[PDB]
Design a protein around this ligand. Sequence first.
Ligand SMILES: [Mg+2]
Ligand SMILES: [Mg+2]
Ligand SMILES: [Mg+2]
Ligand SMILES: [Mg+2]
Ligand SMILES: [Mg+2]
Ligand SMILES: [Mg+2]
Ligand SMILES: [Mg+2]
Ligand SMILES: [Mg+2]
Ligand SMILES: [Mg+2]
Ligand SMILES: [Mg+2]
Length: 90
Amino acid sequence: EDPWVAIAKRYPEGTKLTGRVTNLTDYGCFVEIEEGVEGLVHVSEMDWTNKNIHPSKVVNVGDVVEVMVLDIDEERRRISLGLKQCKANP
RNA sequence: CUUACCACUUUGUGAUUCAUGACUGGGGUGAAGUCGUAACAAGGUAACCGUAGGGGAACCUGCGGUUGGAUCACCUCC
Ligand SMILES: [Mg+2]
Ligand SMILES: [Mg+2]
Ligand SMILES: [Mg+2]
Ligand SMILES: [Mg+2]
Ligand SMILES: [Mg+2]
Ligand SMILES: [Mg+2]
Ligand SMILES: [Mg+2]
Ligand SMILES: [Mg+2]
Ligand SMILES: [Mg+2]
Ligand SMILES: [Mg+2]
């Protein structure tokens, strides 16, 4: 009810977190510490081998990971996290 | 002798019913004829129902309806 309205808090694309994953998909993972709030980070990201990476492979459930916010969709209510960025730039 | 009632019988106009009739509508059956291929597979434009218009023929097209229809819907929110 409350949290989505004042989502300025971590709005800036540059902002980064450490959140904890809930479950995996095969297109992402979802990393949800913010509580009542949850990102995704798509399988495109998480690696520098594009999709040559199953989410299960790089990360597993109940596992904390550093991530930047990239895109918040105020309405439609969906945040786009990035995991390949908060670690190396080879 | 006469009046009344009344059978035979006569006339007029209807109803119903059987037969027959130039010509004409469709229906059934038929190894091997002609024209095509409408349906059954997504039957090669999914089919079908009501209705309307059109076309040698099966049919075609419009409007609404039905599933008694294959394959079924798009990058990332559980
Ligand atoms: Mg015939
Ligand atoms: Mg046919
Ligand atoms: Mg028919
Ligand atoms: Mg077809
Ligand atoms: Mg057909
Ligand atoms: Mg055809
Ligand atoms: Mg007709
Ligand atoms: Mg026509
Ligand atoms: Mg129709
Ligand atoms: Mg109805």
